[PDB]
């Protein structure tokens, strides 16, 4: 009765591995980015990085290295899933369809192994004689690489060094030789072994001692021989010894390393402080070592070629720097990815007070805000400071050679013609129209003529003669109110009468004349099917009666009409075909939009629904972004009417205000679209209706949370740096301690410029910020929590003012977390819940919390210690009561409430579980246990949960950000639809099993190292969204054995992709 649906909107983008090789082909070097769950296959060129195949493999990549087996044409790839699902992958290059053929597969998981402290790493013998994987401590699993062993039958070999920091295979040796540094409790040492296959030894040199702050290993290639251990960079090969102690290196540590050239005369070392070191060696036995200093933070460096170095950052935007030989520095950035990494938190804000919402994230760290929306973005190209325009329509002043070279702008009572000779915007009038009269249409119809339908008289000016050929005017000296002419006929309405004119060769001929009951509001004639310019039907609106009717254009005879409520006249009405069924759009002056289906033959009144829009009048207009043309709405809340399968979407747009729109196809602007406003002129292309746009604003600090302000129109962001304004005055220490300097950056929502910074005390970690309305005081606050780690804790009530932050009250230990419940703050920390309230002050079970969340209800979800806790606030009692506590402890990371029953949750083992109060017995003896009504393994580190949605049959929604930068949605649904769809849930297994021959239920399992249970009611949205990607011949046999229609379920499922 409560069954969920998980789907991801933005995939992870944090970088974890950048091993380079020849995976695509022997003659094409690749870069092999490895995100959390999906590996991106790029090919590096002179320009930069180019994706060729973005394979999302069903696994969490942990160990990944390219090796070349003997007798193999191309180097293979060894993906080690974080669940030990080791597979020797091989790129299958056949044709347009490309898949990942598994050479060998097998779960190499060990039921008794314990992962080594310093992560999981794997190495390959240089002569491909062996695969060595360091999964468990003191357990060097060895996989022979014979042509046999397709099941990957591994075996274990004991290691004397239980704790190993880094391990490699030394070059230039007969037997498999291994070099590595371990951490035996006497400084740090190095050892050598010869790995025996049959026996399952001694190395070239014995064990010595090295620096205790040296951890990284660089094994030099064959020409030199030996290994370099990394303020101490040594070198070791037999008995020869070398060591240097530069002073520059002592500032911080080094994390990245890789060989630069086969000779071994140069190396790369990446510092944690965004410093690019440069190791050098002088040429056999070398003489001495040397260090050099020449960027953003790097997690895995990879020297590509010709000075191009990929700076893969898991902490921030990964860069693509260049190292020039010639401020005299040699670190210049060329590319900067938009990779949202450490999404620490976010919130949903409606800046424009419209239906759609927005997300503001805090990405990056140390050395942070980004804006997340859902509408289609437009990149402005040319800006003109022009006044208000009454309309916009492209004009083809040239002959029938496609494109356009003229723009027509209509003022309140004037028509200014603009000429665009490329990127220039010059207002040049043509001698075929009137520039002092408002024109309702200035397009071209046929016969190389531009129809100028004005309020006074309809004019037709030939493009070649550049002069008016004919002029049709009503024989009553009345201004034209509504006009319509698409390609071959003119349907204009003057007052209560409408006249039909045909676009003849250099002549206008009236074809029909009729009068309506009420005054015509708008006229729209357009072919919605097999019609070449000659529109069969014709739409007309009424103002006195506010009704929409459909009539035949040739005779102006009404066919059907639909009644509407209210008294607002329809601002615009349009009918067009965008899918298998034509749709008719009706828009009112107040912004109400009615969408109904239309038939090109009859035009019966199909289903009609009320769609909200901006408060300003809406003028419907179609846009050509993709092969399937979409409609665009111009109002205070602009939106684009796109579609997915058969239903019209209403995705918003990236603009402040829109007054008019017009497609453009000029030479200087191929896919641009004219945009109008009160005083503005912008252009844009738009391709999809689901891309998310990101705007950046760096802060160079470590943020913790964020909250929006509704009355001051400015965000607030916590700062914590390590080294307008304000300083704390807390009037209520060794030289080397743990102290951070904190601020509070108030970012304007208009100029994106910080306006204040409240510097706090030293050695006080304030990581909380809440915006609410505490108590009866109408003033809106910026409540910030401050914690020192803990015998003290204070909270600053940052009552905002015109320009100065203020404090109202201060009020044993470090508080953990609390958000406003209804109008109060009664936190639950330090093993004691509270009953606080807002004198302008802030004035027991062992309840301490780490994460806290609640919906507007009295229902509250928390966590005491590694368990989802549900708390109810009883207003009669005014405290918290433990309703039902979830057992089976999990290391939680973020918690949310879906509805009154389903409780969404996540934990550090990358798994999601939902609790629910299923019916039970014994009054209250087992109801306190929340039986998990679901188990799902997501594969990401969900960090923050928030309600809201990016759009305007579940009741509610939820968003969650990850540590790798993934956003997604979770819903809930009854058992009736679930149980019927449960049988066909596994139907997709037959057509495709997996990418690496992995069991479907194995991903449906609970991949924690202790348990394993198939998914219970967690319906995936990733697999089902791939149902539409299945080829049509392959789609036929699936769901083929009440009517059992081929596309019956697609309509039933196409409503899911709109969630």
């Amino acid at each position: 009765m409560s069954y969920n649906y998980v789907v991801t909107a933005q995939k992870p983008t944090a970088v974890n591995g950048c091993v380079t090789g020849h995976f695509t082909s022997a003659e094409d070097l690749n870069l092999l980015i490895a995100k959390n769950t999906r590996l991106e296959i790029y090919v590096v060129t002179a320009e930069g990085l180019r994706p060729v195949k973005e394979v999302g493999m069903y696994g969490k990549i942990a160990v990944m290295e390219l090796f070349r087996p003997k007798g193999e044409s191309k180097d293979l790839l060894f993906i080690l899933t974080a669940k030990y699902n080791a597979c020797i992958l091989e790129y299958k290059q056949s044709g347009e369809s490309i898949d990942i053929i598994t050479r060998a597969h097998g779960n190499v998981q060990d039921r008794i192994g314990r992962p080594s402290e310093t992560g999981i790493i794997g190495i390959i013998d240089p002569e491909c004689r062996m695969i060595g994987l360091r999964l468990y401590d003191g357990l060097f699993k060895v996989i022979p690489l014979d042509r046999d062993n397709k099941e990957l039958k591994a075996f274990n070999i004991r290691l004397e060094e239980l704790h190993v920091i880094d391990v490699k295979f030394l070059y230039g040796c007969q037997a498999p030789t291994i070099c590595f540094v371990y951490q035996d409790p006497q400084g740090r040492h190095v050892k050598t072994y010869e790995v025996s296959l049959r026996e399952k030894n001694k190395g070239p040199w014995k064990q010595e001692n090295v620096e205790a702050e040296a951890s990284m290993v660089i094994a030099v290639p064959e020409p030199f021989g030996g290994a370099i251990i990394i303020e101490s960079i040594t070198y070791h090969n037999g008995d020869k010894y070398l060591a240097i102690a530069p002073p520059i290196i002592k500032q911080s540590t080094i994390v990245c390393h890789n060989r630069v050239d086969p000779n071994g005369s140069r190396y790369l070392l990446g510092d944690m402080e965004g410093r690019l070191f440069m190791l050098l060696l002088e040429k056999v036995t070398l003489k001495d070592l040397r260090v050099e200093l020449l960027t953003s933070i790097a997690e895995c460096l990879t020297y590509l070629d010709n000075g191009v170095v990929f700076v893969g950052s898991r902490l921030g935007d990964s860069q693509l720097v260049k190292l020039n030989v010639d401020q005299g520095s040699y670190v210049v950035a060329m590319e900067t990815f938009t990779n949202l990494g450490p999404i620490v938190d976010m919130c949903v804000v409606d800046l424009e007070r419209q239906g759609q919402g927005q997300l503001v994230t805090c990405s990056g760290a140390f050395k942070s805000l980004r804006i997340i929306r859902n509408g289609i973005g437009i990149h402005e190209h040319a800006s003109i400071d022009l006044p208000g325009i009454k309309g916009l329509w492209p004009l083809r002043s040239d002959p029938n050679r496609e494109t356009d070279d003229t723009l027509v702008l209509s003022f309140v009572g004037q028509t200014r013609v603009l000429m665009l000779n490329g990127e220039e915007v010059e207002e040049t009038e043509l001698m075929g129209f009137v520039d002092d009269q408002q024109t309702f249409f200035c397009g071209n119809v046929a016969h190389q003529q531009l129809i100028q339908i004005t309020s006074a008289s309809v004019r037709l000016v030939s493009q070649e003669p550049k002069a008016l050929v004919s002029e049709w005017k009503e024989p009553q000296a009345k201004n034209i109110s509504v006009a319509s002419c698409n390609s071959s006929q003119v349907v204009v309405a003057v007052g209560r009468a409408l006249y039909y004119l045909q676009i003849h060769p250099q002549e206008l001929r009236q074809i029909s004349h009729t009068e309506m009951e009420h005054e015509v509001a708008c006229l729209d004639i357009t072919p919605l099917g097999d019609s070449n310019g000659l529109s069969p039907l014709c739409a007309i609106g009424l103002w006195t009666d506010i009704s929409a009717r459909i009539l035949k254009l040739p005779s102006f005879e009404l066919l059907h009409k639909e009644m509407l409520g209210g008294e607002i006249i329809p601002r615009s009405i349009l009918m067009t075909t965008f899918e298998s069924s034509h749709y008719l759009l009706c828009a009112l002056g107040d912004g109400a939009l009615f969408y109904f289906g239309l038939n090109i033959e009859t035009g019966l009144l199909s289903d009609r629904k009320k769609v909200t829009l901006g408060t300003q009048p809406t003028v419907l207009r179609t846009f050509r972004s993709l092969s399937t043309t979409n409609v665009f709405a111009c109002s205070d809340r602009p939106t684009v009417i796109y579609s997915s399968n058969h239903k019209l979407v209403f995705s918003n747009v990236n603009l402040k205000e829109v007054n008019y729109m017009c497609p453009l196809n000029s030479d200087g602007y191929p896919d641009s679209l004219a945009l109008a406003n009160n005083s503005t002129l912008t252009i844009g292309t738009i391709d999809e209706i689901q891309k998310l746009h990101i705007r950046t604003v760096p802060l160079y600090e470590s943020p913790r949370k964020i909250c929006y302000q509704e009355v001051s129109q400015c965000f607030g962001v916590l700062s914590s740096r390590i080294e307008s304004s304000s300083v704390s005055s807390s009037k209520l220490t060794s030289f080397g301690e743990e102290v951070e300097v904190h601020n509070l950056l108030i970012i304007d929502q208009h100029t994106f410029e910080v306006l204040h910074a409240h510097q706090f005390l030293q050695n006080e970690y304030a990581l909380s910020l809440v915006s609410c309305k505490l108590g009866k005081d109408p003033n809106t606050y910026f409540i910030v929590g401050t914690a020192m780690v803990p015998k003290q804790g204070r909270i600053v009530v940052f009552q905002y003012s015109d320009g100065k932050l203020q404090t109202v009250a201060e009020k044993k230990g470090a508080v953990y977390s609390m958000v406003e419940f209804n109008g109060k703050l009664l936190a639950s920390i330090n093993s004691t819940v509270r009953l606080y309230e807002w004198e302008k002050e802030l004035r027991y079970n062992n309840i301490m919390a780490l994460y806290l969340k609640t919906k507007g209800d009295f229902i509250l979800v928390g966590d005491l210690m590694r368990s989802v806790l549900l708390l109810a606030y009883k207003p009669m009692e005014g405290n918290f009561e433990e309703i039902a506590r979830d057992f089976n402890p999990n290391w939680m990371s973020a918690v949310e409430i879906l509805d009154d029953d389903n409780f969404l949750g996540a934990e550090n083992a990358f798994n999601l579980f939902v609790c629910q109060k299923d019916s039970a017995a014994t009054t209250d003896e087992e109801r306190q246990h929340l039986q998990e009504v679901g188990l799902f393994h997501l594969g990401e580190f969900v960090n923050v949960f928030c309600h809201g949605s990016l759009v305007m049959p579940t009741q509610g929604s939820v968003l969650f950000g990850t540590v790798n930068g993934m956003i997604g949605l979770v819903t809930s649904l009854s058992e009736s639809w679930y149980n019927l769809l449960l049988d066909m849930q596994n139907r997709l297994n037959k057509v495709i099993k997996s990418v690496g021959k992995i069991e479907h239920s194995f991903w449906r399992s609970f991949h924690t190292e202790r348990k394993t249970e198939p998914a219970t009611g967690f319906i995936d949205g990733d697999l089902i969204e791939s149902f539409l990607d299945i080829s049509r011949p392959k789609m036929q046999e699936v769901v083929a054995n009440r009517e059992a229609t081929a596309d019956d379920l697609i309509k039933v499922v196409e409503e899911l992709t709109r969630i």
Binding site: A365, S702, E738, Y765, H929
Partner: protein, 356 residues
């Protein structure tokens, strides 16, 4: 910073500065040392006593032996008795879970009968030739094997065959084989043998079973790690999950920690002095806290390792674990995941799971 946040901030920020997860679980063990309950479980029958708890490696279920000649299987979370293994005509003496194959458990009784049980269905049973008392059992994690020691004979039997394959015996009949156990890696084997002559002294011999060579345990001077050790049951010695830590009694009962790393193998790291009431020990999953059941309230104790020098002050007393009632603790063990709690058995016939 000694906070969950900054360690976790580094974690969620994708900075793979490993060891933080180790430290976080170090913190929660430190945190859980301050928090406080006694939850019982029903049984299909009323056994007089509960012996030899043994936790699952997947934590799905929990077997336990009782004087009623039956083995009760209980789920940890629900605390509901699900299965009751029956078929032993005598009380089982050794029960061990299977690390790899789920649900395949063995149990041996004082009558010389071993029974390999499966929850899904089916069972096997073998009989000792002279129905002697069974001493200890030890499953082989990776290899298909379970070693059987009864008086002084080590039986090498594969359950795929009806009869044991190899038969290896000590130097003397009185040189009894008391305890056998593989390590959490399966690389080394610890064999407890009584010393030639209560003050019954035993020794530990450290055989490398990497090559599956039959251990010539007749020699009392080869691969010896402990000259004298007090052993009465199989729970008196245990190896940490990491396998680098070990606890074993020594005579003047003195509990001492010996590093299992080859660099200082046999070196005595930490020590404390205990009375004769000390019976069984158990190490926390990350090798920092030790649980010990005590015989007759203060029935259990927990300690913490601070510095390794071999002196008395190596650990410090933390707190006590009580039971909602003389009562002597028979068995106890840390739950597989750190910080969850602990389960134990009672000489009076009780199974109580305690959590903070």
């Amino acid at each position: 910073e000694k906070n969950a946040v900054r360690i976790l901030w580094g974690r969620e920020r994708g900075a793979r500065a490993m060891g933080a997860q180790r430290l976080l679980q170090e913190l929660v063990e430190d945190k859980t040392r301050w928090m406080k309950e006694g939850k019982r479980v029903e049984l299909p029958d009323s056994p007089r006593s509960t012996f030899l708890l043994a936790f699952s490696p997947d934590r799905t279920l929990l077997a336990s032996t009782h004087v009623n000649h039956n083995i009760y299987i209980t789920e940890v979370k629900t605390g509901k008795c699900v299965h009751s293994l029956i078929g032993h005509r005598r009380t089982p003496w050794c029960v061990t879970f299977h690390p790899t194959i789920s649900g395949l458990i063995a149990s041996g009784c004082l009558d010389g009968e071993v029974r390999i049980w499966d929850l899904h269905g089916g069972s096997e049973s073998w009989f000792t030739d002279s129905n002697n008392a069974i001493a200890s059992l030890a499953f082989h994690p990776t290899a298909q094997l379970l070693l059987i020691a009864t008086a002084n004979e080590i039986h090498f039997w594969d359950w795929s065959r009806r009869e044991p394959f190899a038969v290896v015996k000590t130097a003397s009949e009185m040189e009894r084989v008391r305890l056998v156990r593989f390590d959490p890696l399966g690389h080394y084997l610890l064999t407890a043998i009584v010393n030639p002559s209560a003050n019954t002294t035993y020794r530990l011999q450290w055989w490398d079973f990497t090559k599956f060579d039959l251990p010539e345990i007749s020699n009392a001077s080869v691969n010896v790690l402990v000259q004298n050790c007090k052993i009465y049951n199989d729970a008196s010695c245990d190896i940490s999950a990491d396998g680098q830590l070990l606890a074993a009694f020594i005579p003047s009962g003195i509990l001492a920690v010996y590093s299992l790393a080859p660099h200082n193998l046999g070196e005595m790291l930490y020590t404390k002095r205990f009375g004769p009431n000390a019976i069984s020990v158990s190490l926390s999953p990350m090798g920092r806290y030790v649980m010990v059941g005590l015989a007759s309230h203060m029935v259990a104790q927990v300690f913490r390792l601070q510095q390794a020098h071999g002196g008395e002050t190596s650990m410090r007393r933390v707190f006590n674990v009580l039971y909602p009632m003389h009562v002597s603790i028979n068995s106890a063990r840390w739950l597989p995941e750190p910080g969850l709690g602990l389960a134990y058995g009672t000489n009076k016939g009780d199974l109580v799971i305690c959590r903070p």
